[PDB]
Design a protein around this ligand. Sequence first.
Ligand code: HEM
Ligand SMILES: [N]
Length: 184
Amino acid sequence: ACTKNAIAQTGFNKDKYFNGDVWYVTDYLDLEPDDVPKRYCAALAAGTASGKLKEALYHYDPKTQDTFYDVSELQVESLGKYTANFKKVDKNGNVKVAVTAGNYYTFTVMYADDSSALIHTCLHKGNKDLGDLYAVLNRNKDAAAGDKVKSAVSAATLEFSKFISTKENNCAYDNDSLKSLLTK
Ligand code: HEM
Ligand SMILES: [N]
């Protein structure tokens, strides 16, 4: 279960964050570390489509090769805090799993600037009991975390040394597919 009520960045600039570009997860912290320790790759595109706030997600396990995409329409809880009901789709936007009540994630933008961000996310999916997940994002897939985001992590009373990096996972991303999914 999730246990944190993350606080959104004061003065969060929604237009800059939801500009349709891609964000790559470079480091993450799972508060409920599973028993199965494996590498992982994730990226997302957030933007507006016909006035609606949307988010496209990509998950890739470099070991098992398990891959999946998701598209969600976001609902606003407050500035910087959203609730997303996701639908699983293929890379072309074709629906594989329709939106289902009870299947959603929340996400809070704790810090963000033109190239980096720190977010908190709580996933709710079926019977699986998931926990809080923090992620450091960057507009560049190979960028080391800068002083700005590292300080934000500290300011949130978190220890960056505990975060797991995805840089050595040999990740590959289909940016074009991610961007196109925003309209699906
Ligand atoms: C950047 C923020 C992320 C968001 C918003 C997010 C969101 C989600 C969503 C919505 C699903 C369900 C997809 C579906 O069933 O169609 C999912 C599943 C999953 N995510 Fe993430 N994720 C993110 C980052 C990550 C990262 C970095 C990891 C850590 C390695 C991760 C590991 C997983 C795993 C293992 C599952 C499968 C869980 C299951 O179905 O049993 N996610 N994620
Ligand atoms: N996740």
